[PDB]
Amino acid sequence: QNFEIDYVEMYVENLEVAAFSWVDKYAFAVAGTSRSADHRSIALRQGQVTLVLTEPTSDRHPAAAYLQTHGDGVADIAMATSDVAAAYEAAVRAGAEAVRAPGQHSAAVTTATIGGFGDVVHTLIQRDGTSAELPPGFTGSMDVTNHGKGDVDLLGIDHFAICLNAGDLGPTVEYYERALGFRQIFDEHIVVGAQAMNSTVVQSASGAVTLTLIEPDRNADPGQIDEFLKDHQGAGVQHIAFNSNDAVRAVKALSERGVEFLKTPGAYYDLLGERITLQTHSLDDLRATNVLADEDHGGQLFQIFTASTHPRHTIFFEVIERQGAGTFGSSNIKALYEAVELERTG
Numbered sequence: 111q112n113f114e115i116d117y118v119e120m121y122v123e124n125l126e127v128a129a130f131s132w133v134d135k136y137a138f139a140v141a142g143t144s145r146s147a148d149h150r151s152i153a154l155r156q157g158q159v160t161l162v163l164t165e166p167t168s169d170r171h172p173a174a175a176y177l178q179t180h181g182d183g184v185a186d187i188a189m190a191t192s193d194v195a196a197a198y199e200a201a202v203r204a205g206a207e208a209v210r211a212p213g214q215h216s217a218a219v220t221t222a223t224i225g226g227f228g229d230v231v232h233t234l235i236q237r238d239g240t241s242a243e244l245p246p247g248f249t250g251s252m253d254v255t256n257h258g259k260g261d262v263d264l265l266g267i268d269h270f271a272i273c274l275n276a277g278d279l280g281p282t283v284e285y286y287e288r289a290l291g292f293r294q295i296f297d298e299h300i301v302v303g304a305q306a307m308n309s310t311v312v313q314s315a316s317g318a319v320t321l322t323l324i325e326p327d328r329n330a331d332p333g334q335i336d337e338f339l340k341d342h343q344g345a346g347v348q349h350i351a352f353n354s355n356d357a358v359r360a361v362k363a364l365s366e367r368g369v370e371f372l373k374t375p376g377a378y379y380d381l382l383g384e385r386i387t388l389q390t391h392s393l394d395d396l397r398a399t400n401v402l403a404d405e406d407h408g409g410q411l412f413q414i415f416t417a418s419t420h421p422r423h424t425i426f427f428e429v430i431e432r433q434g435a436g437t438f439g440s441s442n443i444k445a446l447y448e449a450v451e452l453e454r455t456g
């Protein structure tokens with residue numbers, strides 16, 4: 111198959127609170143809805159991000175048990191492919207858990223579902239790639255916009271960061287490589303004080319689905335990833351990164367709409383000009399927005415984390431601008447997790 115993100119589905123306790131949190135704080139548009147005897151859902155749209163929010167209204171629906179375990183979270187990273195039956199057959203033969211066999215399932219395109227990490231799944235969606243399309247079963251239109259968007263301009267999803275139980279990284283990397291044709295593109299041993307993490311990035315052959323997989327290092331003290339695993343009650347999506355053309359301007363625009371970003375101390379910006387010589391922003395700009403700067407063989411990388419507004423403080427989001435950077439960088443990653451540590455330990 112040749113995987114693109116069709117949509118990301120989150121399971122939610124409260125549809126109207128979640129939908130308008132994305133509309134109001136992040137400038138998503140409402141695109142479509144889907145309802146049955148067991149759920150109500152909305153499809154939200156901005157740039158190339160399609161977010162689906164689903165609230166179960168019956169204990170039949172798998173979200174009821176998910177919400178009881180996790181609170182709100184990502185449940186399905188759905189992938190567009192040209193031949194779903196082929197992609198499924200090959201994935202299952204290579205080891206994928208079969209969750210639902212290819213079929214209509216609603217005048218729908220052909221759809222199937224396989225397992226992913228933890229309890230997150232992947233719906234495979236048949237698309238010929240000629241156009242933006244609503245998730246299957248949804249009525250509405252993809253030609254929608256939020257005219258109150260102002261200066262916020264989220265372009266797409268850059269990657270998903272995922273927390274795994276210790277000892278699960280190596281085998282989850284291998285699963286994505288064998289079942290789905292993903293490749294290992296980056297890896298990083300992360301240290302924050304006396305805690306550490308192991309991480310490996312797998313990415314679909316198309317470039318379009320990236321997962322930054324992280325497990326606790328059992329040789330160091332327990333920290334952030336252990337906390338996530340305990341509070342979430344399992345492996346899961348820790349953050350989603352959204353692309354922008356200009357991270358400084360996105361932080362400003364999102365801040366005004368109510369989004370709180372993590373703080374990075376002035377010491378970091380003092381140390382900076384000796385580490386990297388900036389190419390698209392001023393050191394002043396970065397300092398003011400707590401945006402982090404690093405570099406790849408390919409160019410520069412600007413990233414920032416959002417403070418979690420989840421009741422368990424689990425999932426959070428990231429704004430990322432790539433100026434030729436193709437992967438990630440040690441200094442950004444160390445600083446991102448040090449922002450997290452600062453927020454949570456003080």
Ligand SMILES: O=C(O)[C@@H](O)c1ccc(O)cc1
Pocket residue numbers: 270271296297298309310311322323324351413428438439442443446
């Ligand atoms: O946003 C990041 O930098 C984070 O998702 C990440 C974690 C581990 C890694 O190897 C690369 C990136």
Ligand SMILES: [Co+2]
Pocket residue numbers: 269271322349351428
């Ligand atoms: Co990230």
